[PDB]
Structures are given as C-alpha cells and as structure tokens.
Design a protein around this ligand. Structure first.
Ligand code: NA
Ligand code: NA
Ligand code: NA
Lengths: 331, 333
C-alpha cells in the first residue's frame, strides 16, 4: 500500500569487479518517461553482477551549472560550473570511476583536442548502494562509457535502472530499509522546459504531498512505514542512543532551458534542493551526502517587469517537478 | 635554494595522439634529486608516461587522516575533496587526469579484500593541473598510472623536479612564449616532535618568486634575458588601453601534512592560512585564471602543550608556510 521492497541486511565480503567479465546492460527500468527537450540526452547502464549502475545526462553543447552539496558524506568529482555531462552512479566513491569513462569517451569524440575551451567537463556524484546487495561490484569506466553510448533524447528509465538499481531509503535500521530507484519528471509551461532527475538513497524516507510515508523505514512486524522522527524521539524519551547507518544521500539534477545568471542559477539550485526536504525526511543531515546539479541550456529569455523574481518563480515550479521525480523513484 | 637561472621555456603547444595510441608503461619518476624525510605513515609515489610527458604523484596515508581542502580560482579540478583521506592524488591531464585517483581507489579496495563497509571505504582526493600546453599529445594520467604511483610509493622519499604530476607543470601564462617548465617540489621540517611535510605542483598563471622578491621561474622574455613580474605586463596593457592577455590552464595543487592534532576548525583555518601564504612565492595567485587547491592533512599523532582561537594552529601555520615556500622553490629550481 505500496507493497514493501525491503532491501534486507547487506552481506559484506562478496565478489568485486575483478571476479567477473562485467557485461554492461542498457537499463530500461519499470517504464520509460518520454519528454521533449532537444540537446539533453539520458543514458543508463547497469551490471547485473552488482546489481549497480550509472545514469548519464549528456548535454553535448555544454551547459552552465550550479552545484549545491549538503550533509557530511558528499561523493563528488568535478562539480564544474559548465558541463557536457553529469554522471550519477552507485558504488560509493569507487563509482566516481564511471565519470572518467564518460570524460574519456567525450575526448575521443572531440578527436583528442585538448585546448582549454575544448575540455570535456563531466561532474559525477555517487550513492553508497553496498547496503542493498551482497557484492562489491561498482560502476567502472566501461559502465560510464556504456551509459553515455546508450544515451538518447527524450527518454528516461524509471525505477531500478542506472544509478537507481540499488538505491534505498530509511537507514534508521537496515531491517527497515527499502529499495527506491531513480525517477524523473518533466514539465513544459509555454516555452519553459524543466526536467528533474533524482536518485534517492536517503537516510530518511520518501513522503508524498499528503504527508504519507510512501517508501523507507518499513517494519515487517507492523506492516507500516514510520517517519524516522518517531524512532528518534522514542530513543531520546527512553534515554538510549538513537541508531542510524551511514551510507546515505540523494543525488539529483534540474535541467531547464531558461537563461539564468550565475547568481540566479546558484540561488535556484539552493531553493530547489531545500524544497526536497518536503519529499525526503529528514534531509540534508550529517548522515547524508546530498548533491543537486542545476543546469541551464540558456535558450529562453523570460519576459521581465538585484533580486530575481524569475529564479524564485521558476524555482517554485522546479521544486514541484523534483517532488514528482522523487515520488517516481519511490513508486 | 640555488634556483638555476637558465631558462626552461615550454614552447608553444601543439593534433597529438591519446592514451590508447600508445602501449603506456608507467615509469617510476626519480626527478633531479631525492628528498629524504622521517615521517612514518606518510609515503609518496610518483609515476609518469614518457609519451605525454605527464604524471601523477600519490601521497599514501594508510591509517587515514583528517583533511581540510582549500580550493580557490575559477578552474579548480577536484575529485572527492573528503574530510578524511587514505590518499591524495595529484596529476596532470586536466580533468581527464582525475582518472588516476580512480586507479588509486580501486587498488586500495583490492588491498582491503573488497570490503565495502562504510567505515572501511578507501577515500582518495584528487586534484589536477592542465599540462597540455607544455606538450604535443593528449595522453593523460589514467587508472594504471594512479595505481602505479601508489605501487611506487616509498616511505620518506620524494623525487624533486620533473617527476610525477610535476613532469609538465609550467609557470607564467601571460604569454606562452614566456612560459617556463616548473616541476614538483617538497620540503620537510622537524621541530621538537612536530613534523611538517609540504608537497606542491605549481602550474600557475603567475611566476615563482624567492624570499628577496626576485622572479625565478616563469615569464622569461627571451628577447631581454630576464623574468619580470606579470604585473609589469598587465599595467603596460592597461596604460596602453589595450586588452591584457593571459592563457587559461593554470593552478597550483598542494598538500601540507603534519603530525600535530588539530580540530576540524583549526585544520580548516590552518589550510586557509598556509594557502594564502603561497601568494608570497607565487604571484599573482588565487586568480580567476587559476584552479588552486591545497589539502591540509593531520595524522593526529601529537598534542602540542598549551598555556576559542588557536595559537597552536597559527604558529604551526607560520612554520608550515615556510616549508611550503621551500617546496615551491624546489619545484622552480
Ligand atoms: Na533521454
Ligand atoms: Na615518501
Ligand atoms: Na593518525
């Protein structure tokens, strides 16, 4: 209601990358979102051997980017203010290797030109998905390259796909952790386009607009999911240590076509990222490594007439698109 | 430090091949000279590809060590940037060279028998220099080169000069005709039980300056036989009402490692102080044309005696600032 997807407790000491001839698989997930956003392509690939994967947002023209990183365990490479691709992956910090696969592939496509203005810029972020499985396989260069090679315009594989293969929510106790997925949502308003992509691996739980906990912290003894604050407040009431496992974060992107200055884009990124504490609770905690990329293709000038009404209004809309994406990941 | 007055002009950059065009064998970098130091628990390895030429330098601290990162300028190239690290990987190849850190990470995971508990994660922070203007290939530090640098790590040794990440580092990017090859550099001091190690790979837009204020590496004008401070070029452009010129692809990546226990707040303040101090030896510094990144690392081994603001961090910062200037001068020598 929704049915549980308990991850079960991890088994450590399983086989790693060296044990397999790892075969990239194109991730299709549970269903395909289709959208109209020329110049923005998405690819997703996984290793069944994990299972673990990578999701690549490819913007071949390059696009201005703001990064908003929060919590105590961020796993980020590049974090550039201009990107040709964003690579999201499992495997904790080891999975940043997938982004090197994307960077090297883009250098090849550029016929190995290395002038400073031709540098192919990939920002990468990762989730700790080793809790959700019993292997040590992680996204490697080959998997990042595969995700890029599978990238097509206007498609996103919802659910257990790419970086979302082994994403999970609700880390108060691993016995109550549930598999999430990745999610995406898209809106067009006049000529304005907003795409949200998210891979929620939070310490917290996914919450819908009614306040219902819909994924994470499921107790098989009760058949019910609980907001973590109730666990935490009873630990403090009982004067016992609260418990929670490390290895959490949400990694996300907003892509829009609206021209924004560097200041507007950074403020927009912060607003949208804070808004995600509506659908993920708690969020931005010391136990999380939350990283949001806000990307603009700089195509549309909004009509007007030092503080940006347009960034605030766009931020409010983009916040709703992102909440929709979080709910798709949890579905 | 007897800096060689002779010029080492890089020359103008050149359609060259990339990594898989070559059968790349890592070479253990020995540089011009070995620094020997006494700091158990800290090892340095340096590897290069002749075909670049380009390389990587890895500082390996297997215990793990608390770290503060201080990043400045408009072109920083960083991976991880963790507050706790088992290794720091410094490399050429611009952002492509961040791959070398993935090689270090994967090797450390193999050494840990593929254990993946959160507390057992092997944490590598990586930073890069743009060294493509100093050569004629697209070769960059890859996983194999990072792994090789880690495998070459020797306790208590550092190869000075054109070695590891320093192989194609360069200074003075007002005009590529006046750019000179630098190198990497290290210096070490022991004071009572305090140990301070500085490592630097200067690829600055600016020039290396000695304690007398002499420009000793970068911005060498072969028409005059002397190096001058970039400010002279910039002020002449503005006085002439013509655009100043300067090439992109600059930064200095560095580490300061000490055994003195510091809180996260002290360590971050220490990092900022030491990094700012490097504007003495590198000028200009922390510019929008640079991607300057300093890692300040404590191995948390000794408590300094005491008598909300840290005198110990300030005093240690002053001494570490001198060790780092010495390291910059060894890179430029
Ligand atoms: Na797509
Ligand atoms: Na050493
Ligand atoms: Na220690």
């Amino acid at each position: 209601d929704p049915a549980p997807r308990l991850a079960g407790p991890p088994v450590f000491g399983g086989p790693g990358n060296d044990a397999f001839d790892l075969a990239p698989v194109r991730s299709t997930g549970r269903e395909m979102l289709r959208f109209d956003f020329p110049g923005v392509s998405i690819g997703a690939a996984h290793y069944e051997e994990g299972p673990t994967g990578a999701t690549v947002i490819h913007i071949p023209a390059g696009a201005r980017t703001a990064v908003d990183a929060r919590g105590g365990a961020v796993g980020l490479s590049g974090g550039y203010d201009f990107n040709h691709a964003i690579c999201l992956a499992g495997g904790a910090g080891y999975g940043l290797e997938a982004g090197a696969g994307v960077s090297g592939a883009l250098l090849e496509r550029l016929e190995y030109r290395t002038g400073f203005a031709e540098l192919q810029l990939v920002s990468s972020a990762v989730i700790y998905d080793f809790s959700a499985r019993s292997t040590a396989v992680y996204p490697d260069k080959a998997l990042g390259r595969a995700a890029l090679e599978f990238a097509v315009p206007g498609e996103f594989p919802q659910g257990r796909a790419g970086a979302g293969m082994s994403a999970s929510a609700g880390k108060v106790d691993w016995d109550r952790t549930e598999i999430t997925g990745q999610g995406a949502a898209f809106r067009r308003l006049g000529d304005v386009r907003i795409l949200a992509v998210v891979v929620p691996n939070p310490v917290g739980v996914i919450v819908d607009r009614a306040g219902t906990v819909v994924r994470g912290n499921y107790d098989a003894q009760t058949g019910v999911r609980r907001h973590p604050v109730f666990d935490y407040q009873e630990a403090f009431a009982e004067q016992v240590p609260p418990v929670t496992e490390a290895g959490n974060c949400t990694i996300s992107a907003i892509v829009t076509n609206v021209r924004m200055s560097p200041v507007e884009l950074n403020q927009f990124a912060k607003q949208v990222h804070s808004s995600m504490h509506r659908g993920i609770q708690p969020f931005h905690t010391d136990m999380d490594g939350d990283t949001l990329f806000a990307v603009t293709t700089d195509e549309i000038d909004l009509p007007t007439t030092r503080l940006s009404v347009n960034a605030t209004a766009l931020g409010a809309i983009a916040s709703e698109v992102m909440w929709d994406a979080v709910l798709e990941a949890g579905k």
